[PDB]
Structure 1
């Protein structure tokens, strides 16, 4: 008609709903939905209006509008010290698009031919070193997370870079950058103006990463005209990029794109793999484990691009459904740059507008019995699954992430069985920025198959 979305009653006058949300984001959001009789509704976070598009039939109103209407820039501004000035959403939108296209072109299926054996190579090296007995106890989340960083680095970076900057040194740098982030800055923008110790720690880590890239580039040139170097990887691909205006990507921007790529996939991919395995080993899912086993039954010892990309539709369903049930990114946000009509409401300029994969993936029309993990399900409302976003800002690394998840699944389950050390699959742990299964609950027995 022309009215604002209904607003959930504020009881705590300075914090709003941040506390209820924090404690149980899904339960809280579902209560709002019920109490207000609407899938579109507004909550209050430290005094800021957050309008949630909690009706899957209306997702396109969030994902499809152009940047001049719904803008991610100010929402992702707390990440500027990580990406760098002029990198990603910080750059003007045409330029940001060019940068993200360059990244996407480093993740083409043509590059995937080499990725599959690089991934499988590192997975087997990990398994040989760590899962080496007849049977043993491990933390699956920790191990998947190691496999993901190692396989990613094996895929994206030449041996010279891995030497100087091994998955271990790389993780420490990225952890330093990450620990300095303050996502609360979205709702308290005053924080991006203050002096914080975080700024210096982040800039320290980013500068050191960029120095190591500089030294790698110089080392390659030393190899490079000798014909002794012709190392081709994500670093050299990005350095070869030329913007429409004729200019090359600066080292600064390359660094930023590499950091962005590593941040994007590190926890999400590793959480997707862990949940998938947790489900697949649970006795209730024995039928799904059999289907996976039949899917990979006749794969060669050394997997090829055809096996993983074209011949694992069921494992793909396992991964997507794990993200459907427990999406690692709970909430996507944009700044409303002009009034937008959404369902029967106007969401006013200056609002934050959000669409929550967590809430949408538990819409009971779209996903009946949403806590039941069922890889065979399909969304019952078109576009209801948004675990990788959609439209304007849809995930460009979706295929690369799934490639790693699927390769690990086929390699692990070909050689091992696993046994939960609990009756039920882990609870999600909502306390972190990227949400995965509770770490203390992820201990598992592996059993070598013979």
Structure 2
């Protein structure tokens, strides 16, 4: 009656999923062009997915309440990692309380200490691995390693870090990441079947929870004497009290730690990696010299004020990396009730989606979208959705960018880099969180 245009189904069981796999951006643009409409419906394994692909209409996706546009069903596949009743799996008011508590642990007030702590970890890394006059590295692997160290330095007590060090924490997160199946969104039977991948999620989460409980017990054994107990993400969340007067359970605390550490790890690593890749490319020398000018007068020891107040260009670099190659390609909700978007009604039962990948390549909002240009601004309000928006906007943005900017400032003060390829790497769309193709990320570092 008032449905968006349906892109024709020509291969029935998997309507558009194979073409989407082959070229996510190419596919979606072709739907947009052929149907002459930013708002269109594709068919994924038999499920209607209505894409809100017109930037002018972003608010119709991001602003409706959970009860109308629901995130629970689309995050169901992450329950084995977050836990039953945690985050999106909890009743919505309780979901928001949990997410709010997490947000409060990532506030700007803590950054006074985070900045030197982060730089210290970075400098430790570089000293140990970038210690030659010049050397070849995988930049993606190395940025990932730095982000695990910097994040854990900020958010984990030293006792926790001893128990769960960078190597072990990486392995744990990797076991989780490699064992999740986003396809379960469209093949919900997967969540009910015996799968090795589900078992592995349970093992990893159980290992983490065991470690947390041992740390909690040890702190309680030792605290009365200390006069100075450990303050970290774990202790913060443990002291949270819900509006009904009850504390978070360890189960919930573990899940929220999984959520934070998982969320921050890949996105922040990938963002740092893309930024450095672009900045070291010849097409972008004007931009590199803009970064080197920004940071030229900084102390050897970055402080809060340097990073928070005096790095607007470095931040523009991070943001435009996410603009061009957003780590999260597709944001989704389940439609619980009919919703107006543009000239259309999206029916109850649809999955509705808003794709940072598609929207970031709308040529009205972002002319020449495959050009990386940190000096661009959007020409359509709210077109940039790299960190989402509205009800579920990213709560980790500032902390993520804090780490990115600190690495950029620290790396480029002491090194140049040469990309060992003519072009900036292709994005690799095969993974949950999309980064540059790992095998294309070998670079030469050169000490200054």
- What TM-score, normalized to structure 1? 0.98
Q: Secondary structure at the match of 1:226?
A: helix
Q: Secondary structure at the match of 2:226?
A: coil
Deviation at residue 274 of structure 1 after TM alignment:
0.4
Deviation at residue 191 of structure 1 after TM alignment:
1.4
> 1:303-338, CA deviations, whole angstroms, 9 ceiling, x for partnerless residues?
111110111000000000000000000000000000
Where does 1:73-152 land on structure 2 (aligned, <5 Å)? Answer: 73-152=72-151
> 1:348-405, CA deviations, whole angstroms, 9 ceiling, x for partnerless residues?
0000000000000000000001010000000010000000000000000000000000
Tell whether the 8 Å contact from 1:223 to 1:229 is kept in structure 2 after alignment. Answer: no
Tell whether the 8 Å contact from 1:73 to 1:90 is kept in structure 2 after alignment. Answer: yes
Q: Distance in 2 between matches of 1:391 and 1:311?
A: 27
Q: Which residue of 2 aligns with 1:406?
A: 405
Tell whether the 8 Å contact from 1:220 to 1:229 is kept in structure 2 after alignment. Answer: no
Deviation at residue 179 of structure 1 after TM alignment:
2.1
Is the deviation greater in 229-238 or in 264-273? 229-238
Q: Which residue of 2 aligns with 1:15?
A: 14
Q: Distance in 1 between matches of 2:419 and 2:199?
A: 42
> 1:120-159, CA deviations, whole angstroms, 9 ceiling, x for partnerless residues?
0000000000000000000000100100111000010111
Is the deviation greater in 185-194 or in 89-98? 185-194
Q: Distance in 1 between matches of 2:249 and 2:4?
A: 44
Tell whether the 8 Å contact from 1:5 to 1:40 is kept in structure 2 after alignment. Answer: yes
Q: Which residue of 2 aligns with 1:24?
A: 23
Where does 1:228-267 land on structure 2 (aligned, <5 Å)? Answer: 229-267=228-266
Deviation at residue 13 of structure 1 after TM alignment:
1.1
Q: Distance in 1 between matches of 2:443 and 2:172?
A: 29
When the two structures are aligned, how many residues end up with a matched partner? 448
Deviation at residue 229 of structure 1 after TM alignment:
4.5
> 1:147-185, CA deviations, whole angstroms, 9 ceiling, x for partnerless residues?
011100001011111111001111111222222211111
1:279 correspondence with 2:302: no
- Dislocated runs of 4+, deviation >3 Å: none
Q: Distance in 2 between matches of 1:185 and 1:325?
A: 27
Is the deviation greater in 381-390 or in 163-172? 163-172
Tell whether the 8 Å contact from 1:29 to 1:359 is kept in structure 2 after alignment. Answer: yes
Q: Secondary structure at the match of 2:225?
A: coil
Q: Secondary structure at the match of 1:423?
A: coil
> 1:186-230, CA deviations, whole angstroms, 9 ceiling, x for partnerless residues?
101111122222222211111111010011112222331112651
Q: Secondary structure at the match of 1:75?
A: helix
RMSD: 0.8
5+ residue gaps, structure 1 = none
Change (3 A) 1:114 1:403: same
Q: Secondary structure at the match of 1:341?
A: strand
1:361 correspondence with 2:331: no
Tell whether the 8 Å contact from 1:56 to 1:360 is kept in structure 2 after alignment. Answer: yes
Q: Which residue of 2 aligns with 1:6?
A: 5
> 1:92-123, CA deviations, whole angstroms, 9 ceiling, x for partnerless residues?
00001000000000001111111101110000
Deviation at residue 79 of structure 1 after TM alignment:
0.6
Tell whether the 8 Å contact from 1:221 to 1:229 is kept in structure 2 after alignment. Answer: no
Deviation at residue 341 of structure 1 after TM alignment:
1.0
Q: Distance in 2 between matches of 1:224 and 1:123?
A: 31
Q: Distance in 1 between matches of 2:194 and 2:141?
A: 34
Deviation at residue 282 of structure 1 after TM alignment:
0.6
Q: Which residue of 2 aligns with 1:156?
A: 155
Q: Distance in 2 between matches of 1:78 and 1:443?
A: 33
Change (3 A) 1:139 1:272: same
Q: Distance in 1 between matches of 2:141 and 2:383?
A: 31
Q: Distance in 2 between matches of 1:198 and 1:159?
A: 31
Q: Distance in 2 between matches of 1:291 and 1:217?
A: 47
Is the deviation greater in 277-286 or in 217-226? 217-226
Q: Distance in 2 between matches of 1:35 and 1:182?
A: 31
Q: Distance in 2 between matches of 1:445 and 1:132?
A: 12
5+ residue gaps, structure 2 = none
Is the deviation greater in 348-357 or in 282-291? 282-291
Tell whether the 8 Å contact from 1:241 to 1:248 is kept in structure 2 after alignment. Answer: yes
